[PDB]
Symmetry: none
Subunit: 297 residues, 4 copies
Amino acid sequence: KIGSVLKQIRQELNYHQIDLYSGIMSKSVYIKVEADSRPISVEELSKFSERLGVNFFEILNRAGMNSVNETGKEKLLISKIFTNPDLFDKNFQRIEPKRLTSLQYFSIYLGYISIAHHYNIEVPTFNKTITSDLKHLYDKRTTFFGIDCEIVSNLLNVLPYEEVSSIIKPMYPIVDSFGKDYDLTIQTVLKNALTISIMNRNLKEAQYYINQFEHLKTIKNISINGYYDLEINYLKQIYQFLTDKNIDSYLNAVNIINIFKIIGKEDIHRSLVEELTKISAKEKFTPPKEVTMYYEN
Amino acid sequence: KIGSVLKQIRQELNYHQIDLYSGIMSKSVYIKVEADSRPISVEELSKFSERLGVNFFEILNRAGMNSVNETGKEKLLISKIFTNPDLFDKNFQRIEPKRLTSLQYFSIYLGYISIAHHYNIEVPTFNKTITSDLKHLYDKRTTFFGIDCEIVSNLLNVLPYEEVSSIIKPMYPIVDSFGKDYDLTIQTVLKNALTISIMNRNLKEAQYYINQFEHLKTIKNISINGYYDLEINYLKQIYQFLTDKNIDSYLNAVNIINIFKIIGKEDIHRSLVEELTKISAKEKFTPPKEVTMYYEN
Amino acid sequence: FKIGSVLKQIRQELNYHQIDLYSGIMSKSVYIKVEADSRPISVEELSKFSERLGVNFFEILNRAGMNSVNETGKEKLLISKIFTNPDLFDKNFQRIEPKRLTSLQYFSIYLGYISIAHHYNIEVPTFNKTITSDLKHLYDKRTTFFGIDCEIVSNLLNVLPYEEVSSIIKPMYPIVDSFGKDYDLTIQTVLKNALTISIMNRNLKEAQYYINQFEHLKTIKNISINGYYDLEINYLKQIYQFLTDKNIDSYLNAVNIINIFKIIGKEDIHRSLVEELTKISAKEKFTPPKEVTMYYEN
Amino acid sequence: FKIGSVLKQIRQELNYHQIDLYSGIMSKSVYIKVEADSRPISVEELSKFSERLGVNFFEILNRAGMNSVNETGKEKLLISKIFTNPDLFDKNFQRIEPKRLTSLQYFSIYLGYISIAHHYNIEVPTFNKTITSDLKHLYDKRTTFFGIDCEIVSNLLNVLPYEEVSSIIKPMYPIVDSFGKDYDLTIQTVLKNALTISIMNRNLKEAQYYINQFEHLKTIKNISINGYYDLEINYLKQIYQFLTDKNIDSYLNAVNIINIFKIIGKEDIHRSLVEELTKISAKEKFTPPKEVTMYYEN
């Protein structure tokens, strides 16, 4: 695992075992470490990382951090259980019972409900446990983690906005960045929440989500997702159009859609076209020739 | 420092030591961990994280991994020195001699050369030892890591392209994704290399980087940077315009430039506006009124 | 008119001798008097000499001074001067007012004074006291209308509520025959002005009426459609389509047309269309494009 | 020549009595002769009746049939019929060719035949043998020009290399006065046609000269600029800028102007600009927009 990578990197850079442990451990010890016959401490790994000149996280990854365990395998199975709605039937009953085991499982669990709804598969236990499920996990909370934000995105997917809004408010504003993985998760929520708000025409909530996203850009070391920046700005154009039928705003929205096509993000392009169509219809306003043409197909 | 977070998280989620150590370590020892009196091992933290349901890296990041060691501290000093060119000499004298101690230090070293070049400061040893420095670091190399890609971006900024190209080729194509941090770094090289290629009108090289970037989009679990993807596409639009003077390609590029403005990414926008003005001039083309309105100012 | 002298100028410029012009048409002696401008020339004779010279009949007339000459031209000309210097109004208006029904021309000039007065806020009480009676006197028995009638109608849309004029316009359309470029322009001005007012009052059925009348003109043989009018009217049509079924493409087309007027240098028109679209957009609670608002604002 | 009866129709239409017309111009017995078309009318007399009626002089003439009358007019109409019926060529060219120098109108008509001949690839060997001679005979000692002179030029540009006509055009501009809407059109057509050709031959120096000459026309008193030409000449001005320094904005403007012609329904012009833009693009080794390329091929 880790020790093997250390040896791999060490020799690649032409460093001798000595160069690594010299002032950190015994040569006899460092030997067992590279042999993976002895666990290494986070501290130690951090020192070798500095010694090697190769980023810590990368080393962890090269060692297999990118999957590795139960929850991992279980999480991977969802996209698989997706394509095969038969893989559902069996799996669902193995997860449902342990849905409150950990937040990771509750997310995984919600992953099935999403599939279940998609393939109109009946889930009678869902409607009678979700509420109490949510309370047992969020009634007494102060700090929220990436997994919680992952959970919210999922809830917004298989639950009425009003039934989830309660859980989201306590999560924002965010004031600290805890890594790129964490950064992504906290943006996804806002993107999901904003879309829905725009669609329900709940401008008050839309404005708040737009603001929460903007605030994120002010955090130190934050890693904003360009696609999101692009999509959330599209939703902002729509917001301004809904708020006062600004013509430029509508054009900016349309041009942003066109950019997604140009760069090849077809799924998002489709989504945003159907979205603009559905939005314009409600406002009883016909979208330009370009968009109506696209959506027609 | 990890134990506090583990306790904090365990506490927050309402878990007992039992729920964490059971099947792993003795509650006696586990107490020492949450006490941070006993260094924890990667394998242990990984197990705990799964038990907690909170991502391994989010935990390490909350623990403080974001810098800590002398290499990191030296890294942050680079920006402080950019704002105050006065700090150069004194600090450079400390770094320059250590530029080969490790790949991180060499990278840090290149940052100084960049500061130097910007403020037209004299760094006569650089042209005296750079070629020799590269030979020493990359002659016997067979594989590369994030830091090597970072070093390459650095070199591209303070050295003629031709003196860097050979060092770059053996680094691509990338086959695996080793985390979001590493993913971003492998993408930065391609964006800088492609920009310089376009600017020098080296179409053969420009098209190689465009293809290498596209290849990254096929890698499992790869995390593509939205801003880079939009920017490389702009470079691709320029590429097509230089290849067979297409009007739509020029319009697309200009359009993409415009979206960076609309979404608030002003530095990229300024950068692209300047670049298009120079590209246009070399092709005896007058840029759109708007683009020259920004650059000119 | 100096028709004879123009014939001499042209005849000699083309190297023709007097014989080449008068043989078969009039005696040598009489033709000499014609070129000396001491003998009236008949329309047919001029048309004949015109064909001989190979120079267009109308061009010759114009060169002779039909570009103005008589009492009615002097008066219609006087309007421009009085517009800049309204101190002249009063005394001249006292001469015109009484003669406003002498002919359709004088009536047209008369409305020219009313327009001026409405502008510099001058009091013209006689107007409201006689207008309805004048229009009836001029149009109660009519069956066919002429260019000057369409000029009058246009002048009325300028100093009278739309409704008091509309009923007078309808009987003049549709147009069936073209009677020259001057006539063509005049019959077109009415529609453009009428359609502008119709769109401004969101009167959609009236707007379509005029849009239809204008479009029908394009089916007339030898008609001279005014390009500027075709552009402006088409912009009003784009606005009509937006007002009917909030079509964005129609809104863009209109904005794009306003932009064309800017490019080719028609500022006054560009100016008026920007103001127009700004008011149209407000009533519809739509914020016009960045472009338009920058111009209007300034 | 149906003036007298038109005056009668108009007079009665406006409910005027003969007295109102001839009072102070002629006698009752004479004016009667005038309305029955038994006595020709002088230009001065028609101008006077025209003012009494309040109807425009030129409109009265056109209502009287001034739109044709004489043999030259007949030869003019016969051209359109020959363009569609090429089989009518020979017999009519035999009658016209020998009369091509009878007058400037006949020369213009003759040039019309040559155009039709080139279109349907019909042999006209005399043309190439006599053209230089004809031009020399017609323009060697000329000092001032008329509308028919600019028509001939537009005609020449249509059947003669640009260099054999360039020097014949120069002495005709700048125009200084306007001589009626008909004349106004003709003098603009030359510059529009000349510019188009210059742009296609990439003769930027000449193109600039025509762009300037057109602009000068706008400063002329009472001039009637043709909106379509104004829009099309601005288009050429945009292509000019593009050919001079490859200005991207200029190219976009050219494209936009093409869009406008499509928007307002001028399909012939749209098709033409689409085609010229395609050719000018291919020559500059530049691929035109997605919009035009499709419209062109299809």
